[PDB]
Design a protein around this ligand. Structure first.
Ligand SMILES: Nc1nc2c(ncn2[C@@H]2O[C@H](COP(=O)(O)OP(=O)(O)OP(=O)(O)O)[C@@H](O)[C@H]2O)c(=O)[nH]1
Ligand SMILES: Nc1nc2c(ncn2[C@@H]2O[C@H](COP(=O)(O)OP(=O)(O)O)[C@@H](O)[C@H]2O)c(=O)[nH]1
Ligand SMILES: [Mg+2]
Lengths: 428, 425, 159, 65
């Protein structure tokens, strides 16, 4: 059975969730009504009528985003109980999300999660989708993560976190919300996959030739990467078969649980018939910084763990030959206490794309998951922005007025300073 | 449902308020009978923000009309959209405030204030999820000034969890009814600093300057000045009224635009400056120009703490992004370095009436201290000679109230200077 | 008095001595009222423009002209602390005991403002010390409530 | 070059390539924290209300007659 429950919090979490479940349906042959003309039972429950229902919860503090799901293409895919909404949002304020507005819906959200957990006979844990920037994405997620650690003590919790970018962002206070949620979620998360909106924006512009990527364009690319990471949990492979394995394979130091994901190839659907990329070409592209989900320089960092997840027409001996070349021509430095080896997974189904979408259907794809000290650069970027504003106490009054102590800002920043030091200590 | 309760107080408040309703009703396709007749569903998507749904497909402004002078009732009711307003939402006195803040705040205004609050309560309680309040008034008179600020403080104690937003008309000798205007405005600013979340500073000095210097209008009427006010009011409320990912409610706007609780006085701007098609780089340059500001302050003399820019119409969104980033890169010294990415842009497909493209500017600038310095200097010239002080003390006011208002406005000026000189250490 | 009336009021407020003279000769109305009923006399009396007060009075200005609050130019010069103007208005027949809409006499206003020398000249010219404003306060009461010891001694001699 | 952990599944295959070896109920506290925040927010709003109730006493100090 080994079930996994997906939780989508706030606008970013919900919209990425929409793209993920659309792609999961196409991969598993499930129609938008849940009918299908099983390894995927880990993510989809089955009714008496033969209807395949996602083991998913969608939460937002205001109703406009979830109302679009309730009336859209997939209105019959999810049950109404799985789609929870409040009346007033968190207004880009972590304090409203966590304290004043979040406290009003937390018990109802946990009751709905419990209803899905009761349908499980071997619940592995949770996959949590949310932004760092939103008041709900930041504040409500940290409150829910705190409550899930108490109510499901032995269960694994993994995150897919939307890291803010000025090219794609809604708030000047987003660096505050990002540090606040990281501090309060750190001890409650086993593994977190950060998705830098600037990296996704760059890939859509550079590889898909989309000058102005919409949330649809960005989310279809994000869902393609998320699917590459969760495929192992949905198809019964040999690498990352359970939520616990993600921690075992990628996280040797508990606080340093932020692996860098690198995806290839990203090809435009609207481009002339090209010779398909070989295993060697897509593997080489895994060490190209332009293909990363988080902007950072891994040549400045050291590797703790490295997993390569192939999908499609991929011969194991061709992977071995590709990896041999990578250990020669490129300088991949591992920490002196880590085995230096690359863990390999192969899913033989052809990669799936949304029909009529921007992404071209490819013969072979790869997602590399690497735990590198280079990702500390993304923490430094957020911390610097936090520092600039906090030194003047700019915007802090909004948080203090919404059930938060000013001291929580200092406690959060001190934890981030300790995290930056943890990375620096491993990096030598 | 994100409802806003609109309040209009005094002669200025009701005139600019009526013009706001005529302009936004045209944009939303609402005729004076409350019937919808537009061609787009985007017009009705967020109609509930400013309008109540009435019997048989009709829409009624969520507006409360207040004045101590009874003749204001008649003028609004006779206007083109006069009939659109709910008759029980007209709260009018009979004696007037005689351009005296004390009469509006403590005498005539204090007698009418409960009647207004009953109407505010009725509108607020019917809201599915109240965002907050929007008030239109001048600071130079007696009703809008005195009674408006009394109304604000009473609403603040009854609804402390709701946003208080004002469109406050600053007096100028260029457009002046009396010499007691600096007293009325200083006494009001003191109240605004403490009791509003965000204030749009509509400066009559800037309105006069735009009319004469930009359109060469030699004898501007209040109608000529109000054309700029209504264009600005429509622009700054665009993201509240039309489907839009950015600046959805008043709280989210206040959170990102106000770094310090007292520094909530915005310098509005508008482009193109018309009368009763520009390119994206032309709109962008005009929007950041001193000549297009609705507050008589030079942006070049201060630094922007935060900026919001709303572009309206069919235009290249790529061009908007490039142009907005270009202003920040080329003119880095006019934006504080210690609030990263403090310039936010939103684009709305629907342009205002008689325009294909427009841009609305909302600046939280330290340069606004020039407007407060101007009023303070006029207040001090008058107060040192105690000229007309008996008008206020005769209503029960003490001279200490004047001294306190003066100190708090000067404290506000020094606070802006503190952040203008602050370094990103 | 149309454009001349507004121009005369502007020049008396600004203290444009020569511009007031130019406008009189051109026929500007001496008692041309403003929005609050203030004549150029009231404006010169508030702002302390002694020469303008004298030119206006020689050109037949109404020394006892009341604005809409009922204040004559004597009430205003007494409030604003212009001793020399209070002396000139008095010599030109100003009403020492004129009452505004609040019951204030010029003595009420000089006592509240704490203008010791003005109180002395008002009393010399016959200001009634027993006059009560609509709050039921005499000028002696005003000084004692303000805490003005020097002024309460100056007014006790008659009251 | 060394190939360990050769795990063969239904729709997949997995292994390692080692180039070189290493050289060498808390629920009550949640309620107490949310309680504190709520009691602090109320204390903040009650202080704003006392300051406005203070001004109301000053305005009643005018309409005496
Ligand atoms: N990739 C991606 N990022 C998104 C999306 N929507 C918003 N974001 C990002 O997420 C942040 C905004 O947070 P949200 O999740 O939208 O806010 P929220 O959690 O709903 O809270 P409220 O906005 O107050 O309702 C910014 O960094 C945005 O750039 C989306 O659909 N895709
Ligand atoms: N922009 C603008 N300013 C006005 C208008 N009417 C009055 N004012 C200004 O507002 C002040 C007078 O206040 P007002 O609201 O008319 O009187 P009240 O009813 O006693 O508050 C002066 O500074 C005028 O210049 C108007 O229609 N437009
Ligand atoms: Mg939202």
């Amino acid at each position: 059975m080994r079930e996994c429950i997906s939780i989508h919090v706030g606008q970013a979490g919900v919209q990425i969730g929409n793209a993920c479940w659309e792609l999961y349906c196409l991969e598993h042959g499930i129609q938008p009504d849940g009918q299908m003309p099983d390894s995927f039972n880990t993510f989809f429950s089955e009714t008496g009528a033969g209807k395949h229902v996602p083991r998913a919860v969608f939460v937002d503090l205001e109703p406009t985003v979830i109302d679009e799901v309730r009336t859209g293409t997939y209105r019959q895919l999810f049950h109404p109980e799985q789609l929870i909404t409040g009346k007033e949002d968190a207004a880009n304020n972590y304090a409203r999300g966590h304290y004043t507005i979040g406290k009003e819906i937390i018990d109802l959200v946990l009751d709905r999660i419990r209803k899905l957990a009761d349908q499980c006979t071997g619940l592995q844990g949770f996959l949590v989708f949310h932004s760092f920037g939103g008041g709900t994405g930041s504040g409500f997620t940290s409150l829910l993560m705190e409550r899930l650690s108490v109510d499901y003590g032995k269960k694994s919790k993994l995150e897919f976190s939307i890291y803010p970018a000025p090219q794609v962002s809604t708030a000047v206070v987003e660096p505050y919300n990002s540090i606040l949620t990281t501090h309060t979620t750190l001890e409650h998360s086993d593994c977190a996959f950060m998705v830098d909106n600037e990296a996704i924006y760059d890939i859509c512009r550079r590889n898909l030739d989309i000058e102005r990527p919409t949330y649809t364009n960005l989310n279809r690319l994000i869902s393609q990467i998320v699917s590459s990471i969760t495929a192992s949990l949905r198809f019964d492979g040999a690498l990352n078969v359970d939520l616990t394995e993600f921690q075992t394979n990628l996280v040797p130091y508990p606080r340093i649980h932020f692996p860098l994901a690198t995806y290839a190839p990203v090809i435009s659907a609207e481009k002339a018939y090209h010779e398909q990329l070989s295993v060697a070409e897509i593997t080489n592209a895994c060490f190209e910084p332009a293909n990363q989900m988080v902007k950072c320089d891994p040549r400045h960092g050291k590797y703790m763990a490295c997993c390569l997840l192939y999908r499609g027409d991929v011969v194991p001996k061709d992977v071995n030959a590709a990896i041999a070349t990578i250990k020669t021509k490129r300088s991949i430095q591992f920490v002196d206490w880590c085995p230096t080896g690359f863990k390999v997974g192969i899913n033989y189904q052809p990669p799936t794309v949304v029909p009529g979408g921007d992404l071209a259907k490819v013969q072979r794809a790869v997602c590399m998951l690497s735990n590198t000290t280079a990702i500390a650069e993304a923490w430094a970027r957020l911390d610097h922005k936090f520092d600039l504003m906090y030194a003047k106490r700019a915007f802090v009054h909004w948080y203090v007025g919404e059930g938060m102590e000013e001291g929580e800002f200092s406690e959060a920043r001190e934890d981030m300073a300790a995290l930056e030091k943890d990375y620096e200590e491993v990096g030598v | 449902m994100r409802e806003i309760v609109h309040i209009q107080a005094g002669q200025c408040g009701n005139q600019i308020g009526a013009k706001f309703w005529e302009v936004i009703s045209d944009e939303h396709g609402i005729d004076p009978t409350g019937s919808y007749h537009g061609d787009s569903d985007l017009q009705l998507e967020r109609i509930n923000v400013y309008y109540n749904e009435a019997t048989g497909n009709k829409y009624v402004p969520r507006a409360i009309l207040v004045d101590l002078e009874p003749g204001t009732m008649d003028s609004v009711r006779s206007g083109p959209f006069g009939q659109i307003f709910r008759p029980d939402n007209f709260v009018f006195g009979q004696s007037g405030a005689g351009n005296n803040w004390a009469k509006g705040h403590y005498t005539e205004g204090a007698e009418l204030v409960d009647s207004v609050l009953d109407v505010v309560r009725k509108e607020s309680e019917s809201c599915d999820c109240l965002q907050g309040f929007q008030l239109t008034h001048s600071l130079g008179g007696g009703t809008g000034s005195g009674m408006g600020t009394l109304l604000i403080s009473k609403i603040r104690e009854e609804y402390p969890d709701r946003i208080m937003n004002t469109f406050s008309v600053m007096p100028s000798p260029k457009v002046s009814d009396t010499v007691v205007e600096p007293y009325n405005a200083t006494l009001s600013v003191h109240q605004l600093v403490e009791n509003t979340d965000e204030t749009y500073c509509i400066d009559n000095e800037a309105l006069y300057d735009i009319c004469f210097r930009t359109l060469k209008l030699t004898t501007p009427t209040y109608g000529d000045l109000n054309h700029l006010v209504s264009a600005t009011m429509s622009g700054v409320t665009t993201c509240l009224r039309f489907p839009g990912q950015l600046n959805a409610d008043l709280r989210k706007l206040a959170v990102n635009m106000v770094p310090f609780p007292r520094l909530h006085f915005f310098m509005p701007g508008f482009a193109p400056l018309t009368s009763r098609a520009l390119t994206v780089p032309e709109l962008t340059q005009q929007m950041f120009d001193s000549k297009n500001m609705m507050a008589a302050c030079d942006p070049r003399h201060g630094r922007y703490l935060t900026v919001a820019a709303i572009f309206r119409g069919r235009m290249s969104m790529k061009e908007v992004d490039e142009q907005m980033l270009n202003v920040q890169n080329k003119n880095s010294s006019y934006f504080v370095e210690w609030i990263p990415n403090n310039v936010k842009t939103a684009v709305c497909d629907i342009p205002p009436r008689g325009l294909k493209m427009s841009a609305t500017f909302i600046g939280n600038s330290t340069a606004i201290q020039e407007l407060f310095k101007r009023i303070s200097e006029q207040f001090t010239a008058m107060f040192r000679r105690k000229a007309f002080l008996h008008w206020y003390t005769g209503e029960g006011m003490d001279e200490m109230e004047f001294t306190e208002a003066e100190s708090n406005m000067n404290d506000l000026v020094s606070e802006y200077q503190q952040y203008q000189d602050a370094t990103a250490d | 008095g149309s454009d001349l009336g507004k121009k005369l009021l502007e020049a008396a407020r600004a203290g444009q001595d020569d511009e007031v003279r130019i406008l009189m000769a051109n026929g500007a109305d001496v008692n041309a009222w403003d929005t609050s009923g203030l004549t150029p006399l009231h404006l010169a009396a508030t702002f302390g423009h002694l020469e303008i007060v004298e030119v206006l009075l020689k050109h037949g200005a109404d020394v006892n002209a009341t604005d809409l609050r009922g204040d004559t130019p004597l009430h205003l010069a007494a409030e604003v602390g212009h001793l020399e103007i209070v002396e000139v208005l008095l010599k030109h027949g100003a009403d020492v005991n004129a009452h505004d809409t609040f019951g204030y006499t010029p003595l009420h206003l000089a006592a509240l403002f704490g203008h010791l020398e003005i109180v002395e000249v008002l009393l010399k010219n016959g200001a009634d010390v027993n006059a009560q404003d609509k709050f039921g306060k005499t000028a002696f009461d005003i000084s004692i409530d303000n805490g003005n010891e020097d002024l309460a001694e100056i007014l006790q001699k008659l009251n | 070059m060394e190939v360990i952990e050769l795990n063969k599944a239904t729709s997949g295959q997995s292994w390692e390539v080692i180039l070189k070896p290493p050289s060498f109920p808390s629920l009550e506290e949640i309620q107490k924290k949310l309680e504190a925040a709520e009691e602090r927010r109320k204390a903040h709003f009650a202080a704003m209300l006392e300051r406005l109730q203070e001004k109301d006493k000053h305005a009643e100090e005018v309409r005496k007659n």
